[PDB]
Amino acid sequence: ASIDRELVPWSDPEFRNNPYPWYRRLQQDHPVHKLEDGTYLVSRYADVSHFAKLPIMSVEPGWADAGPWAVASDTALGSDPPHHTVLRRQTNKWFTPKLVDGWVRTTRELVGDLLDGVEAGQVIEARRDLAVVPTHVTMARVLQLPEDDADAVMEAMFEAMLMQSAEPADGDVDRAAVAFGYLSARVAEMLEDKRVNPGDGLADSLLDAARAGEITESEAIATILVFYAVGHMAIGYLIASGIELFARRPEVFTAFRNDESARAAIINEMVRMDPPQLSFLRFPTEDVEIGGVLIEAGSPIRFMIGAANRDPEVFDDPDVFDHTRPPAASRNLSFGLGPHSCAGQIISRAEATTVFAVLAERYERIELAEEPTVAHNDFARRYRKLPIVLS
């Protein structure tokens, strides 16, 4: 209780900015820690790896209770197998590598356009203009939905994410209700337009799957809304994080420039050191013993991704950025694992590669024009602004 505040002060500004020193104590001394409220924190790589992916780990109860976020219950994120596999089939077939090569053409075009527009030495707000809008429009093009709402989409997800903290402030649930009301209204308008003017994008595919009985109508519309809303979000964070990293560690940007074959490794090390999603929940459908601690069926288990990605039992010098870590020790948990591993992962890596590549094509050096403005919490990392100058 006061023990919980010492290990994981979820609301503390310092913990929120950089929890990683606290994660060490957790992982070393309290690897399976039961909080006050009943949630077990699981922070060792081995335990996250082995346990989070088990068939007994249900994703159902938390999202079903999540108020405004219950929309996730009608997607892969909040649905267990067997139906999980069928929801995932609906979108996986849209995001094979060859399909993704074509989708990220949009990413490349928009980045090139932005960069063509600038004057030498001009301050670029990299979070909106190189991260959020390119990825938002990329996904909207795949869906075949209108492309022009990135800014209000991003504000809405900013508001919807507040209640995902382990310690929501008063009113954060209400703010999420407002956010999801907006996204629902926008999706409803866009789908009425699509009934009268159908396309052949991922949104038309999902609607057809619901008409064909493969998924429900609610599941089609919830999947549309989620992919449309989050297309910019965690991927927008990874892009901005990598840009900041290129700026504070220019030898990394130079390596990315000089060595095409290192690119996937560099992006994967960025992803390891700064996951945008710091945990997820699971609800075991039967008792399970982890680290010698018996967790009862139904108890919340919060698997700590960020903490696990610095496990020194797996990663030597875990707080050191090193893109040369060997294949035997370069697997991180930032995209999850098991059947729920991120449904955006192949397009995410390709979008981040595209933006960094365009930058690499045109410049030698990234600098921060001022300190970045961030809005992190215990659950998700987030930039508000990332002013840069390219040379």
Interface contacts to ligand HEM, rule CB under 6 A = 59, 75-77, 88, 226-227, 230-231, 234-235, 238, 275-277, 280, 305, 334-336, 339-340, 342-344, 347-348
Q: 123 phi and psi, to 5 degrees?
A: -70, 125
Residue 308 annotated as lining a ligand binding site: no
Q: How far is the CB of 1 from ligand HEM (least distance, A)?
A: 27
3-class DSSP state of 199: coil
Instruction: Determine whether the annotation assigns residue 343 to a binding site.
Output: yes
Helix axes 233-248, 250-258, angle to 10 degrees: 100
Closer to ligand HEM by Cβ: residue 16 or 302? 302
Q: How far apart are CA 390 and CA 162, in angstroms?
A: 33
DSSP annotation string for 126-149: HIIIIIIHHHHHHHHHHHT-----
Residue 8 is which amino acid? V
Q: Which is nearer to ligand HEM, 97 or 117 (CB)?
A: 97
**Of all residues in this chain, which one has the CB nearest to ligand HEM in the complex?**
344
The HSE-up count of residue 291 (CA atoms within 13 Å, CB side) is: 20
**Residue 342 known to bind ligand:** yes
* Strands, sheet with 301-304, edge to edge from the N-terminal-most edge strand: 32-34, 40-42, 301-304, 279-284, 57-58
Nearer to ligand HEM, 210 or 369 (CB): 210
Task: Report whether 232 belongs to an annotated binding site.
Answer: no
Q: At what angle do helices 345-362 and 97-116 cross, to 10 degrees?
A: 40
Q: Helix H segments across the chain?
A: 2-7, 13-17, 20-29, 45-51, 60-64, 83-92, 97-116, 126, 133-143, 150-161, 172-196, 202-211, 217-230, 233-248, 250-258, 263-273, 305-309, 345-362
Closer by beta carbon to ligand HEM, 172 or else 351: 351
Please identify, using beta-carbon distances, which residue of 5 and 105 lies nearer to ligand HEM: 105
Residue 235 or 314 having the CB closest to ligand HEM: 235
Contact 70, 64 (CB under 8 A): yes
Q: How far is the CB of 82 from ligand HEM (least distance, A)?
A: 13
Nearest distance, CB of residue 140 and ligand HEM, angstroms: 11
- Least distance between ligand HEM and beta carbon 89 (Å): 11
- Quick one: tokens of 153? 């989409």
Binding site members for heme b? 84, 88, 282, 340, 342-343
Binding site members? 84, 88, 282, 340, 342-343
